[PDB]
RNA sequence: CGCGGCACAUCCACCUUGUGGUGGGUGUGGGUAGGGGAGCGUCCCUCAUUCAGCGAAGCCACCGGGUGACCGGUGGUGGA
RNA sequence: AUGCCGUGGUGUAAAGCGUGGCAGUGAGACGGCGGGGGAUAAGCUCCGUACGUCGAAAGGGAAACAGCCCAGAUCGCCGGC
RNA sequence: UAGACGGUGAGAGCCCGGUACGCGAAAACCCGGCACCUGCCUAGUAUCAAUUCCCGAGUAGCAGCGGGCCCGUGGAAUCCGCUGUGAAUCCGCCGGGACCACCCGGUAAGCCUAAAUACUCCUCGAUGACCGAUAGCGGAUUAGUACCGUGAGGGAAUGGUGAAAAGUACCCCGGGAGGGGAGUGAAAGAGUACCUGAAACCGUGUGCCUACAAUCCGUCAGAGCCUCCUUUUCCUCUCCGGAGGAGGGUGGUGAUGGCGUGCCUUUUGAAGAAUGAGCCUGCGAGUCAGGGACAUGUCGCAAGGUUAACCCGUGUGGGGUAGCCGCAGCGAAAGCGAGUCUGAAUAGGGCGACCCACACGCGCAUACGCGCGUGUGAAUAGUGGCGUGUUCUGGACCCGAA
């Protein structure tokens, strides 16, 4: 029995050229260049769904470091003060309080300031 | 298309009763003056074909 | 174990006993799958061919110079990557006759007839038609008073040409000699219908 | 009832065939060869050991000839004359064939492995030395 | 490390007690050449069953699904 | 000093040894240490090393970096060290 | 006795050609019988003597050089060629693997012979787990045609309207080609460019973005605009119709920040400035034959397993013992045999055979099973099918020279 290869072969061709809409050039009109882009387009999501855990953290740190300095204490000494008083609030929620409610992030500063050791440069 | 056996290795290897392959030993045909009798006697008899050359001798007899 | 002989347009006249070493063998599934497969393979006519690059016509020369043009070197105009060249590893004429042993064939037939006789399907009739000229409207009605199913294997003698002609053109009726029972035909049928002259020829061929 | 959509092969007797050269998810482009040498396009013969003088030209010939007239004999031990014949009687060349201990149209020779108690009376070709003393020690006899 | 998903290997109790599933321990799963294990899709045949001029195949779009090859539902086109 | 050979303890699941099936591989590269040829030149050559990494190893660091340092990716997470 | 197959406006045993089953041949040729015709025989047979005659000539033998047989000139017989030499007619001559002798077999140098077997340009009738237009013959189409070559030779591409041409009367723009309106048809989303009509490639309309920006063309963040379906609280025209904004959501786009050196082959190492690819669609590469060889899965029978050719069957079924492998090994071999070879050796080795967990039994032993027992019934095991991996011979995974 001889088989025409065509009904089988057109199945991995439609589902590349549906996941390749929006690209510009030969990379959305031809099969041999949309396959080469999907190899790069799916690796750039596996590389970046793990990198973006470290890229929202990098923004929460900068938003805490900004709103800490409106209450004249560094980020170097706010996280020490919050770990000493036992406040286990993560940095996503510690940033969204600093944006959306400024009179509640202040009370987490006056707790981290008061729970800090008295001579921060003294050996301990 | 009936498979031939190698016509030379069937003069240099035979079989014992339990599937072993035996052979003879060399250095005993000529130049036997300077060989003492503790060397011509070690080369007498038949030994089992060694464990690393039993796949290329099976596939010549068979 | 005891199958009663029926008569065309009539009654039960006698009884024929089915022996146990021929109709009560246990049903072995993994053996009948090998005898059925080895029989449809013998039905393959095996007549299919293509041409290689050495039998497609022409192609004897080398078409152009190997160095100089900028095209790929090609060697023959009928090599298998050309449109119109020979087929590589194409089908040749082949035989498919497997070589199943005699005991694996006989003991799969006896497991096939046993599985029909265990559920009450072996019937025995004294003749299909009560004359010497054939007729189908009677033999359809007579096989409809026996069974009401779609597949019937009618085993009658070889020299009974009066009744063999009577069941040739029924839809879903097969006809075979007593010494031509095989495993693929009993297993297709639901209802094996012997003859009392034909069952005594199969039992006395196996003691 | 057993129909043809109820027959299936035994579990494990029909395993799939390894089609090779059909993608990187299976045995891929090189189809289990890898190399760029003789093994990658051709076959290396068995008799060839890279150039040095091979295993069938280093070792010498096995000594001696084969006999053109070696009349062999078939073998039945006296321990299976006992078990096949547990009550005695005449044991010819013919009855040993039917009982399944010797080949058709060949010559028999009774050896002596085992114990014999039954009063057998065996006719054969060319008895052993230890068979005329395990048969005459039970009242039997050994003719030709 | 914390919380969820999957896979293999062994261990511990249970039932036809490996032809194997159920339940929790612990360990383990980057990979080329290469070895082993298990599957998807096309086409032909046989057995059974089912849909089709009240619109099959094939082709196109859209809404969904599976750990992967890939699959399904609705509409449009079309004519065995 | 090390390294190797044997034995008695303690520790460790995925170590070993024997016999079959099927292999591939036999052009290696640079770094640390020990030496030969060279001019104690070389991104030079040829060796040793239960030495590493690459090859066949992505991630973070050395501005960029096959071979250096840290660490071995089963998948998810807008969570901590 | 017809449900084979095909046609008919779609899947038909009952519409048609037909099938099952029967009938049919003026003449021609083939075969068969009887006649005519043509030929042959009608004189030997049996016993007996053993003298004589004959029984296939430049042939056989021998020699020289070659050919071919398992046999590559070897110790080389039988068989055939050429060149020399060259017998004998039964007490004859030749063969039985140099050669002799004895024995058994046979009559060379004259001739003819059915059947079993090999083949298919062609003729009729059947069949396909073969192809369906880049397949299948090169050839479904002017096909060995066009075309190329002085020549021998090489050697293409091109099939499908519809059920039925009912093939768009007639009018309008136009020189026409082509269109529009009508019409035919179930369908013109079938218009002699014609069934279905994918992709590359090429227009047109439209929502968004784009003229201060250095972009393996993506991915993660991410504003803004457009589009379509909905809860809320309102306008309440409310049976309305969902009128407008806010909130949420699907789909399109993506100002803007972070990461980011295309795929493939070959390499110590490639984004490469090492090799390959302009794009798409189809085609293009571990396949077969054998009772082959080795392993392994699985079914059958199991001290046995199994048939080959062949025969009888309307088939896949039933027969067929020749054979192969198992059944006992050692040895160069004569051979001997649970043993055999080496040897002067009941010395030692080499290969090969040989069952306990008992009780009883045991010259019984401190104890411990050696020697030997009926079973207490220790577990050996091969052969043949079909699968898979590798392999041997063949073109042997596919393409490529001078
Ligand atoms: Mg885009
Ligand atoms: Mg992290
Ligand atoms: Mg010698
Ligand atoms: Mg000497
Ligand atoms: Mg040719
Ligand atoms: Mg050529
Ligand atoms: Mg062709
Ligand atoms: Mg047969
Ligand atoms: Mg590739
Ligand atoms: Mg290699
Ligand atoms: Mg190489
Ligand atoms: Mg290569
Ligand atoms: Mg040499
Ligand atoms: Mg892995
Ligand atoms: Mg890991
Ligand atoms: Mg691999
Ligand atoms: Mg429709
Ligand atoms: Mg189809
Ligand atoms: Mg789909
Ligand atoms: Mg649909
Ligand atoms: Mg459809
Ligand atoms: Mg080398
Ligand atoms: Mg080297
Ligand atoms: Mg080195
Ligand atoms: Mg080094
Ligand atoms: Mg150095
Ligand atoms: Mg160097
Ligand atoms: Mg170098
Ligand atoms: Mg790295
Ligand atoms: Mg490593
Ligand atoms: Mg790095
Ligand atoms: Mg960096
Ligand atoms: Mg920290
Ligand atoms: Mg029909
Ligand atoms: Mg008719
Ligand atoms: Mg004569
Ligand atoms: Mg001569
Ligand atoms: Mg010759
Ligand atoms: Mg002789
Ligand atoms: Mg004559
Ligand atoms: Mg003649
Ligand atoms: Mg003839
Ligand atoms: Mg013929
Ligand atoms: Mg024909
Ligand atoms: Mg063609
Ligand atoms: Mg077509
Ligand atoms: Mg011309
Ligand atoms: Mg018109
Ligand atoms: Mg019109
Ligand atoms: Mg109309
Ligand atoms: Mg219609
Ligand atoms: Mg239509
Ligand atoms: Mg066209
Ligand atoms: Mg069209
Ligand atoms: Mg601008
Ligand atoms: Mg820059
Ligand atoms: Mg960007
Ligand atoms: Mg290089
Ligand atoms: Mg490499
Ligand atoms: Mg470039
Ligand atoms: Mg390049
Ligand atoms: Mg190029
Ligand atoms: Mg290409
Ligand atoms: Mg393609
Ligand atoms: Mg021997
Ligand atoms: Mg001994
Ligand atoms: Mg096969």
Helix (H) or strand (E) holding D84: helix D78-84
Q: Which chains touch D (3 or more CB pairs under 8 A)?
A: B, C
From residue D41, alpha-carbon distances to A80, C88, D33, D65 in Å are: 69, 17, 9, 42
Contacts 24+ apart (CB under 8 A), B44-47: B46/B22, B47/B22, B47/B23
Sheet holding D120-123, edge to edge: D89-91, D120-123, D142-143
Q: How much helix, strand and coil, in percent to the nearest 5, is found in chain A?
A: 65, 0, 35
Distance of CA A13 from the midpoint of ligand 20 (Å): 20
Which residue in C29, C116, C184 is closest to D1 by CB distance? C116
Which residues neighbour D12 within 8 Å (Cβ) at sequence distance 6 or greater? Answer: none
Helix (H) or strand (E) holding C5: strand C5-6
Q: Which residue has the tokens 């089988």?
A: A8
For C79 and G129, how far is CA from C1' in angstroms? 29
Which residues neighbour C3 within 8 Å (Cβ) at sequence distance 6 or greater? Answer: C15, C16, C17, C18, C117, C122, C123, C124
Contact present, A and D (at least 3 Cβ pairs less than 8 Å) = no
Q: Cβ distance D85 to D121 under 8 Å?
A: no
Q: Which residue of D has its CA nearest to C32?
A: D7
Chain G nucleotides near the protein (CB, 7 A): 1-4, 20, 127-139, 144, 154-157, 199-201, 216-221, 252-254, 257-259, 262-263, 265-267, 279-294, 297-301, 303-308, 313-323, 325-339, 350-353, 373, 384-395, 397-402
Q: Which residues of D touch B4 (CB under 8 A)?
A: none
Interface check for D60 against chain B (CB to CB < 8 A): the answer is yes
- The set of residues with CB closer than 7 Å to nucleic strand F is A 46-47, 49-53, 56-57, 60, 79, 83, 90-92; B 51, 54-55, 58; D 32-35, 37, 39
Number of domains in chain A: 1
d(CA D64, CA D59): 15
Q: How many CA atoms lie within 13 A of A95 on its CB side?
A: 15
Which residues neighbour C59 within 8 Å (Cβ) at sequence distance 6 or greater? Answer: C53, C76, C77, C78, C79, C85
d(CA A6, CA A108): 67
Q: Which ligand is nearest to the CA of A14?
A: 19
Q: Which domain holds residue A115?
A: 1-122
d(CA C37, CA C44): 11
From residue D12, alpha-carbon distances to C105, C123, D2, D16 in Å are: 21, 38, 22, 10
Whether residues D61 and B11 touch (CB distance < 8 A) is answered with: yes
DSSP class per residue in D16-80: PP---SS-TTSS-TT-S---SSSTTTS---SS--BTB--HHHHSPPPSS---TT------B-HHH
Whether residues D59 and B57 touch (CB distance < 8 A) is answered with: no
> By three-state DSSP, how is residue C163 classified?
helix
Query: Shortest Cα distance from D27 to chain C (angstroms)?
Result: 20
Q: Which ligand is nearest to the CA of C70?
A: 62
Other CB atoms within 10 Å distance of the CB of residue C158? 13
Per-domain residue ranges for chain C? Answer: 1-207
Q: Which ligand is nearest to the CA of D49?
A: 13
Interface check for D5 against chain C (CB to CB < 8 A): the answer is no
d(CA B52, CA A45): 52
Which residues neighbour C110 within 8 Å (Cβ) at sequence distance 6 or greater? Answer: C22, C23, C25
Which residue in D55, D57, D62 is closest to B53 by CB distance? D55
First to last CA, chain C: 17
Q: How many CA atoms lie within 13 A of C29 on its CB side?
A: 11
Bridge partners (DSSP) listed for residue C175: C154
User: Would the Cβ of C82 be found within 7 angstroms of any atom in strand G?
Assistant: no
For D91 and F5, how far is CA from C1' in angstroms? 67
Chain E nucleotides near the protein (CB, 7 A): 19, 33-39, 41-49, 58-62, 69-71
Query: Shortest Cα distance from D93 to chain B (angstroms)?
Result: 27
Number of residues assigned to chain A: 124
Q: Cβ distance B13 to B21 under 8 Å?
A: yes
Closest to C150 measured CA to CA, from C121, C171, C175 = C171
Q: Which chains touch C (3 or more CB pairs under 8 A)?
A: D
Q: Cβ distance C35 to C183 under 8 Å?
A: yes
Whether residues D6 and C29 touch (CB distance < 8 A) is answered with: yes
């Amino acid at each position: 029995a001889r088989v025409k290869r065509a009904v089988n072969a057109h199945k991995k061709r439609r589902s590349i050229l549906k996941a390749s809409r929006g690209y510009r050039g030969q990379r959305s009109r031809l099969y041999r260049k949309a396959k080469e882009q999907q190899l790069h387009s799916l690796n750039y999501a596996y590389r970046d769904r793990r990198a973006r855990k470290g890229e929202f953290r990098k923004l929460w740190i900068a938003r805490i470091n900004a709103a800490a300095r409106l209450n004249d204490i560094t980020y170097n000494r706010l996280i020490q003060g919050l770990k000493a008083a036992g406040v286990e609030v993560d940095r996503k929620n510690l940033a969204d309080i600093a944006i959306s409610d400024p009179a509640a992030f202040t009370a987490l500063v006056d707790v981290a300031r008061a729970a800090l050791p008295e001579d921060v440069n003294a050996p301990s | 298309p009936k498979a031939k056996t190698h016509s030379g290795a069937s003069k240099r290897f035979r079989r014992t009763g339990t599937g072993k392959i035996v052979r003879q030993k060399a250095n005993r045909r000529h130049l036997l003056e300077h060989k003492p009798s503790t060397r011509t006697r070690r080369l007498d008899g038949r030994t089992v074909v060694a464990a690393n050359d039993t796949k290329r001798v099976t596939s010549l007899l068979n | 174990l005891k199958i009663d002989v029926k008569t065309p347009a009539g009654k039960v006249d006698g009884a024929i006993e089915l022996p146990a070493e021929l109709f009560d063998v246990p049903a072995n599934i993994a053996l009948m799958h090998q005898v059925v497969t080895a029989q449809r393979a013998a039905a393959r006519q095996g007549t299919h061919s293509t041409k290689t690059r050495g039998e497609v016509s022409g192609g004897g020369r080398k078409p152009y110079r190997q160095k100089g043009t900028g095209r790929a070197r090609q060697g023959s105009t009928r090599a298998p990557q050309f449109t119109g060249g020979g087929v590589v590893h194409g089908p040749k004429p082949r035989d498919y006759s497997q070589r199943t042993p005699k005991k694996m064939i006989a003991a799969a037939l006896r497991g096939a007839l046993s599985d029909r006789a265990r559920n009450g399907r072996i019937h025995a009739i004294t003749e299909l038609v009560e004359g010497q000229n054939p007729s189908t409207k009677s033999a359809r009605a007579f096989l409809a008073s026996l069974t009401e199913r779609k597949q019937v294997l009618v085993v009658i003698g070889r020299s009974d040409e009066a009744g063999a002609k009577s069941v040739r053109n029924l839809p879903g009726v097969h006809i075979l000699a007593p010494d031509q029972l095989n495993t693929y035909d009993v297993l297709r049928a639901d209802d094996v219908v012997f003859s009392v002259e034909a069952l005594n020829a199969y039992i006395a061929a196996n003691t | 009832t057993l129909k043809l959509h109820d027959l299936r092969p035994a579990r494990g007797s029909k395993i799939a065939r390894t089609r090779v050269g059909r993608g990187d998810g299976s045995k891929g482009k090189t189809a289990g060869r890898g190399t760029k040498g003789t093994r990658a396009r051709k076959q290396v013969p068995v008799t060839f050991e890279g150039g040095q003088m091979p295993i069938h030209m280093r070792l010498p010939k096995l000594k001696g000839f084969r006999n053109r007239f070696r009349t062999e004999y078939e073998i039945v031990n006296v321990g299976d004359i006992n078990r096949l014949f547990p009550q005695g009687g005449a044991v010819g060349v013919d009855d040993l064939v039917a009982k399944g201990a010797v080949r058709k149209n060949a010559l028999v020779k009774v050896l002596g492995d085992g114990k014999l108690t039954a009063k057998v009376d065996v006719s054969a070709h060319k008895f052993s030395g230890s068979a005329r003393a395990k048969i005459t020690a039970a009242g039997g006899s050994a003719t030709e």
